[PDB]
């Protein structure tokens, strides 16, 4: 359900989240719809940037 970011990721498009290494992301293909309690945003993240909690 929850995954942790392995690396920093920066997004400039409204569909994708930016996140920092170590950020916990709730998972709502290659890109997963996720929610960040840190920022309150919901958006896609690349699955190769995260690992299970």
């Amino acid at each position: 359900t929850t995954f942790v970011a392995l690396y920093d990721y920066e997004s400039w498009i409204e569909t994708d989240l930016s996140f920092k290494k170590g950020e916990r992301l709730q998972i709502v293909g290659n890109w997963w719809l996720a929610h960040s309690v840190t920022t309150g945003r919901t958006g896609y993240i690349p699955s190769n940037y995260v690992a299970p909690s």
């Binding site: 690396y7 990721y9 569909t15 293909g29 290659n30 690349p46």
Partner: peptide, 10 residues
């Protein structure tokens, strides 16, 4: 949106 190719690592 989910089926896009994976981006490279940093």
């Amino acid at each position: 949106l989910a089926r896009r190719p994976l981006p490279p690592l940093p």
